[PDB]
Amino acid sequence: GTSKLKYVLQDARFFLIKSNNHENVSLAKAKGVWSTLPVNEKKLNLAFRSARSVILIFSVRESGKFQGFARLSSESHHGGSPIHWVLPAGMSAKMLGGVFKIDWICRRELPFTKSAHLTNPWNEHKPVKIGRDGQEIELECGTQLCLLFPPDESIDLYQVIHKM
Ligand SMILES: CNc1nc(Cl)nc2[nH]cnc12
């Protein structure tokens, strides 16, 4: 069903995450962590304090798809055991140094062809697939986008609801 999912998404904020490779999204699904560049790290930390739920919606660049979405369970933190991100050219471990804990809500894929009817007011009403890493997605667009994903029957939202 979709009722607990809708409850988690109620009054949530949504951010598009654009990963340069599949490896880091796979690592994030395994370990429940994400790291981003400092400009987006600051934005996500602000949002985490401001809203009942902050949702990251993941897309691997050039994949033509979203790979799932997750809810922040912490602000970023440093000093943990270094996460073995595969680094793109020009990107270093130091500027992925802040680590967010996340709880996956859906680890299933959604092709961009299925979200072509959704436009993001915060990016000039371009299709929601379009946007830089960190682009915020307006509430209604983000809610509808998350509801398009196939159900992930491996996930139980009971614990996530109690973190709000
Ligand atoms: C683990 N974080 C990231 N990994 C990759 Cl491959 N690309 C990115 N662009 C913004 N953040 C990232």
Tokens representing 68 are 């799932």
DSSP-assigned beta bridge partners for residue 139: none
Method: X-ray
Cβ of 44 less than 6 Å from ligand 1: no
Total structural domains within the chain = 1
DSSP 43-112: HHHHHHHHSS-EEEEEEETTSSEE-EEEEE-S--B-SSSPP-PPPPTT--SGGG--BEEEEEEE---EEG
Cβ pair 46, 4 in contact under 8 A: no
CB of 59 within 6 A of ligand 1: the answer is no
Q: Ligand 1: does its nearest atom lie under 6 Å from the Cβ of 24?
A: yes
Ligand 1: residue of 58, 91, 100 to mutate (most ligand atoms within 8 A of CB) is 91
CA angle 110, 111, 112 (to 5 degrees): 115
Give the position of tokens 């994400």. 34
Q: Whose CA is nearest to atom 6 of ligand 1?
A: 20
Question: What string of DSSP letters covers 8-41?
Answer: HHTT-EEEEEEES-HHHHHHHHHHTEE---HHHH
Nearest CA among 121, 105, 142, 111 for reference residue 10:
142
* Structural domain boundaries enclosing 108: 1-164
Instruction: Single out the residue of 19, 38, 163, 39 nearest to residue 105, CA to CA.
Output: 163
DSSP 5: H
DSSP state letter for 151: P
Helix H or strand E segment including 137: strand 136-137
Measuring from atom 4 of ligand 1, which residue has the nearest CA? 19
Q: What is the largest CA-CA distance in the chain?
A: 43
